[PDB]
Structure formats: C-alpha cells, structure tokens
Design a protein around this ligand. Structure first.
Ligand SMILES: COC(=O)[C@@H]1C[C@H]2c3ccc([N+](=O)[O-])c4c3[C@H](C[C@@H]2N(C)C1)CN4C(=O)OCC(Cl)(Cl)Cl
Length: 296
C-alpha cells in the first residue's frame, strides 16, 4: 500500500557498510538475484505484505540464500501469523496483569546499544512462576512476548534506525541469571522453549547480540571450554559472562544508556514503576517517531 511505502521511506534503509554480508545495502549480484527471485515467488503465491528488502533478506540469510527454503520459512511464518492473530495483536491483546506480575519475571526494553539496537533485559534468574501463575498463564506470557516483538517491528526499530542514522534490524539482549536454581530453571523451561521456537521460526535474524550475565560457574565454564569450536560469527554475537560483566556491557552500550544496577549511569523513576514497568528509548522521542505514531 502507499502508507507502508511512506513508513519504509520514513527511516534509513541501509545497514552500515561493515555489517554482515547479505544485509540491506550490502548485497552482491548473487544475493540480489536471490531476493528478486524470492520476491517473484511470493507475489505469484498471492502475498502482498512483508515483501520489502529487509524482511525478505532476513529469511534469505536464515536459509543461507536458498530461495526455496526461505519461501517455505516465509510461508510457515505467514500461516502462524494468521492462526495466532499476530497481524492484529497490538489491538487485540491487553496485558493488564503486567503491574501485578512484572517483578516475578522482569522483562523490559531500555534505550539502545552503540550500534543503535534496542536493548532488551530479561531477569530470568529472578523468575517466580509459582506467584506468576496466581495471576496469568503461560499462554498470556507468550502473547505478551509476541506483542513486544510486534512492537519492536512497528515502533522501536524504525525509531532506533532514525536515531542511529542507519537501518537497525536487531535487538541486543541482556539476560541476568542471578538467582537461578536448578528448580527454577526447570520451572521456566517450557516457556523458554516456546519463546525460542517462536523467535527462531517467525523472527529470523532479529537477534543482534545476546549477553548472559551472572552465569553460574558450571554454565560459564562450559562456554569457555567450547568457545574455540564455535563459529566466529556466533562468538561475535553471543556472550556468556559471570559476575564481572560490567566492563563487557559498557563496551557494547554507552554508560548513559545502561541502567545503574548493571554498571551504567541510566536512571528511572523508582516511585513510578521503575525499570520493570518502563519503556524508555528513541521510540518515545518525538524527533524519532514517524508516520507509525508512538508505541502503545
Ligand atoms: C521483532 O524482533 C524482536 O523483537 C527481537 C527478536 C528476538 C529474537 C529473534 C530470534 C532469535 N533467534 O533466532 O533464536 C532470538 C531472539 C531473542 C531476542 C530477540 N529480541 C529480544 C526481540 C533471542 N533469541 C533466541 O532464540 O535466543 C537463544 C540463543 Cl540461540 Cl541467542 Cl542462545
């Protein structure tokens, strides 16, 4: 439609030249041929939405540029979007529980990284599902996850792209394991498995950086010993850190963007919900909000 054209022209469209190959603005002739092919197949099948360069190149990158497999992945995602109701979830779903249960599984976005990525915080080690299940269900926790993802697509990434001066496609995740136990790890395992399935199949190439902090000794030790056998791309994206994580985070996230509790300088009003109920970032700055309007 013409409104989506205005939306896609409302923010920078190119990744920086030193980003990964196959990203927007950094295609060779082979990759460019694959995008046009993939696009032709999907139009011929009757798809109209989500055929912009950024979306298609993400599915291509997830399947090593195999057009047929990327089309299959796109078709699986679109089927889920119809069954789950994802295209209207921002209107349909209302997580009014959140103020009651946020402290039992803290999840919040807060500002951006040095590359413009919105930073997502998950205090998994604090999880208390026994108390969380008094108020809400796992199905509603997953709806809230998809709601956030959709809010990242529609609102946070376009604002982050404008604030950074280049296309921003991905998040930066900080997962805090402080307080995790074997018991609580098993309790959250079903949720995490569902979340990962959704992320990997329906949001490919949206993970930019993933930091685990306060990892227990045995978990941390395994990654240290197997890091040499891991893809150097993987090693640049995924970090398993112990209790001295502050300096590593500050290399990735400006001090004024990183919350105090994690070694930064960024502060929020603890009397008005604190970080758990906050959603601070460029997507709340009118200078960086385009025709999509401001996020809910
Ligand atoms: C619209 O896009 C968004 O809103 C992003 C998408 C989301 C995401 C996409 C894909 C994967 N993924 O491909 O797997 C993945 C995530 C998780 C974190 C990301 N953001 C917090 C939100 C982490 N994540 C994952 O599963 O974590 C396990 C590993 Cl493999 Cl990193 Cl240890």
């Amino acid at each position: 439609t013409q409104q989506e054209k205005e939306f896609l022209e409302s923010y920078p469209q190119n990744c920086p030249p030193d980003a990964l190959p196959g990203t927007p603005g950094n295609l060779d002739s082979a990759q460019e041929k694959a995008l046009a092919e993939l696009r032709k197949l999907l139009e011929d099948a009757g798809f109209i939405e989500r055929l912009d360069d950024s979306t298609l190149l993400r599915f291509l990158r997830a399947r090593k540029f195999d057009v047929q497999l990327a089309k299959e992945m796109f078709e699986n995602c679109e089927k889920w979007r119809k069954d789950y109701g994802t295209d209207t979830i921002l209107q349909d779903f209302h997580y009014d529980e959140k103020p009651l249960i946020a402290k039992f599984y803290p999840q919040y976005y807060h500002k951006t990284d040095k590359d413009g990525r919105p930073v997502y915080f998950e205090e998994l080690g604090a999880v208390n599902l026994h108390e969380m299940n008094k108020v809400t269900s796992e199905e509603r926790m997953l709806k809230n996850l998809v709601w956030e993802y959709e809010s990242v697509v529609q609102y946070r990434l376009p604002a982050c792209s404008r604030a950074a001066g280049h296309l921003v496609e991905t998040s930066c995740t900080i997962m805090d394991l402080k307080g995790i136990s074997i018991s609580s790890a098993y309790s959250v395992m079903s949720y995490v498995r569902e979340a990962s399935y959704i992320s990997q199949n329906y949001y490919p190439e949206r993970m930019g950086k993933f930091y685990i902090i306060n990892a227990p000794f045995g978990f941390s030790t395994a990654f240290r010993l197997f890091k040499p056998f891991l893809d150097p791309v993987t090693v640049s994206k995924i970090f398993i850190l112990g209790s001295s994580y502050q300096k590593e985070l500050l290399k990735q996230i400006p001090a004024e963007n990183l919350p105090v509790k994690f070694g930064g300088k960024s502060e929020v009003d603890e009397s008005k919900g604190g970080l758990y109920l906050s959603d601070i970032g460029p997507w709340r700055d009118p200078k960086y909000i385009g025709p999509e309007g401001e996020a809910p």
